[PDB]
Amino acid sequence: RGWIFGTTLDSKTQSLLIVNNATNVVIKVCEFQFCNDPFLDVYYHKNNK
Amino acid sequence: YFKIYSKHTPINLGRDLPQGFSALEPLVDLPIGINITRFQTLLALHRSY
Amino acid sequence: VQLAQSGSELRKPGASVKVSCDTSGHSFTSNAIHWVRQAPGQGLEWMGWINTDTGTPTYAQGFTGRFVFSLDTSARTAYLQISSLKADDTAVFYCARERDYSDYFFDYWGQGTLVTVSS
Amino acid sequence: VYADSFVIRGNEVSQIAPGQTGNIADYNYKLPDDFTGCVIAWNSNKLDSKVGGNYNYLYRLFRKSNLKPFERDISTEIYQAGNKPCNGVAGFNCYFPLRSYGFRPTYGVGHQPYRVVVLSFELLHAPATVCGPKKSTNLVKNKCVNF
Amino acid sequence: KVGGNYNYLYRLFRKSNLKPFERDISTEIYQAGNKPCNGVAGFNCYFPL
Amino acid sequence: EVVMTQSPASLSVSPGERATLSCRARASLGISTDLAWYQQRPGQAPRLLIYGASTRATGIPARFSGSGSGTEFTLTISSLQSEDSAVYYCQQYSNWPLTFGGGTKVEIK
Amino acid sequence: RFASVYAWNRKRISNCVADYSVLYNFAPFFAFKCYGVSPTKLNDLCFTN
DSSP states (O other), rough: EEEESSOOTTTTOBBBEEOOOSSSOOOBBBOOOOOOOOOOOOOOSSSSO | EEEEEOOOOOOOOOOOSSOSSOOEEEEEOOOSSSOOOEEOOOTTTTTTO | OOOOBBBEEEEETTOEEEEEOOOOOOOOOEEEEEEEESSSSOOOEEEEEEEEETTEEEOSSOSSOOEEOOTTTTSSSSSEEEEEETTTEEEEEEEEEBBBBTOOSEEEOOEEEEEEEEO | EEEEEEEEEGGSSSTSSTTEEEETTTTTTTOTTOOEEEEEEEEOOOTOOOOOBBBEEEEEEOOOSSSSSSSOOOOOOOOSSSHHHHHSSOBTTOOOOOEOOOOTTSTTTTTEEEEEEEEEEOOSSOOOOOOOOOOOOOOSSSOOOOO | SOOOOOOOOOOOOOOOOOOOSSOOOOOOEEOOOOOOOOOSSBEEEOOOO | OEEEEEEEEEEOOOOOOOEEEEEEEOOOOHHHHHSEEEESSSOOOOOOEESSSSSOTTTOOOOOEEEEETTTTEEOOOOGGGGGEEEEEEEEEESSSOOOOOOOEEEOO | OOOOOOGGOOOOOOOOOOOOGGGGTSOOOOOOOOSSSSSGGTTTTTTOO
């Protein structure tokens, strides 16, 4: 889902936020501060649910 | 100008990168500008297999 | 030689000062008036000049903005305005006038005006 | 239609052109050599200057390298202008790139602030979106007509 | 000056056009008629400056 | 821009002795006799002393004499008086950063 | 003080390092029309005097 572009990926420089949706796509390049990580529930198991 | 070309190519039976020939069609152009020199992905690792 | 100039005043920080320079004492073959500043113990340094009959001032490097040069309705009496006085702003301000046109040496000088900053 | 504008000193009006170089066309705004479209400039000393000086305008002075055409860089930092690494704040051999202008009405022509806008176009084989004041007509087939 | 600046002079009368990159600050009374211009000035006698 | 340098910094000589002061302007192309001298007694404003290379103004006695050409200029005085307690400066009307010299602090014993 | 047209003064420059871009801030001129070389590349050629 999505792609991100830039030169530093920090708060001082602008960067893209190309993200994919089920029936949409959002592109809004802005001077984003931080990009920590995708939210993970530590489980990451799909063999059962 | 930010350009994206895409083509949904079927047939991925056994080969990771099958041979043949397919040409990608234009999708959209964007007036981004900036000096992008970095690539990064937003893979959703909440559930994987 | 003895152009009438305003007297000394005592000013508090942040106040404003007005200094005049009367001219009609003699006859002048020129169209400009000059200002000369001297530190209490140091030498002389220029600030600028304004063109008579045009009213256009001209500022030096280190004396731009805060200093104000003005003329009269008769374009004869020149006034000097300053605001936001500092502790180091104390000095003496003279008013020099040219002798003949295109003779950039000053001969007519006012008696000088003293500005003191204190409380 | 792309209408982007900014305010620069009148001394740099002629610098906005394809292939130009200088202090404002190499660090702030660049035009490509194959640029199609053009620019409009007119004096704006009437409302862009004060007797004390209008210090609301900033321009870049120092950069690592000349930028590519049609790029924007609003980053603020301290250029390495000396052997000693620039830790921060300011100091000798550490120049802050963004300096200010000193517009005032007393200055003569050339130094007065100027207001400029450049319109960017492109005539490629793409579906038209904006057009001129024209009127459509009926379609004629199988006849020699000036289409 | 409001009265008028008369400190700038120029040359108007000469026997012939001069070559590029030459000067002539000489002053003399040009002869502009059959009457000789012995000195000073007069009819058909012009001061070039 | 054209800027002066003046030495000696101060003078302390009894009245009636000849003294010489030098004002040198650091300029590549020189000044060409576009210099003036000024005398400022404590209190009142400076008064014009010499304009041009050596010519004297109106109301000044012939006691003072000056010389110099191109880049270096020198002032010579005779019959120094008690009332001549003043600091002497030099000015160049050659370019248009009008500045003054460092000054020579001449004191009467 | 500037000279008159009939007595223009020739001033020579030699044995120094020039910078033809600093002269923009010296005077409020606008055109700076030049004939033999572009004003763009004045500080790259090397002359005699």
